[PDB]
Design an enzyme around this catalytic site. Structure first.
Site: not given
Ligand SMILES: [Cl-]
Ligand SMILES: [Cl-]
Length: 162
Positions: A20, A11
């Site tokens: 994202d 991540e």
């Protein structure tokens, strides 16, 4: 290697609000803030999470703190689920980490839809499961990461993270 290092690699780490891969407001180490298209709403959720007026920016320590809570919640989410627990329990330590990563990325619900792959993992049919997991929006949308997790399930080692 471990769960934390593993997700940290998947991540990344960002100290400023960002969008994202699905376009949702996130911060830190994959900490989703909201599915809302509103930035103010995101800022608000962030402040609420941190306990202070952040103005869209946090420290490393704060990110780490969200991360620990989020890892913990994921594990608990698994353990609390009747369909997940058994799978999780049948696996070895490396494979478990693979399961926690999916859970972290996609939530209970996303994980839920892999019923068939889960059964395979439970039966220890590695190569078959790997094939089944690949037949998913998940793999089509985030192929590199999906490949890493899938290899992990397949081999029971950390080779994709090395
Ligand atoms: Cl929170
Ligand atoms: Cl990816």
């Amino acid at each position: 290697m471990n769960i934390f290092e593993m997700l940290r690699i998947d991540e990344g780490l960002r100290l400023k609000i960002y969008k994202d891969t699905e376009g949702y407001y996130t911060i830190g180490i994959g900490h989703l803030l909201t599915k809302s298209p509103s930035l103010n709403a995101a800022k608000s959720e962030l402040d609420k999470a941190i306990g202070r007026n952040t103005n869209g920016v946090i420290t490393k320590d704060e990110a780490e703190k969200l991360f620990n809570q989020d890892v913990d919640a994921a594990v608990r989410g698994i353990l609390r689920n009747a369909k997940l627990k058994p799978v999780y329990d049948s696996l070895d330590a490396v494979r478990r980490a693979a399961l926690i990563n999916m859970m972290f990325q996609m939530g209970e619900t996303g994980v839920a839809g892999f019923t068939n792959s889960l059964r395979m993992l439970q039966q220890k049919r590695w190569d078959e499961a790997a094939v089944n997991l690949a037949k998913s929006r998940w793999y089509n949308q985030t192929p590199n990461r999906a490949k890493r997790v899938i290899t992990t399930f397949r081999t029971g080692t950390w080779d994709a993270y090395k």
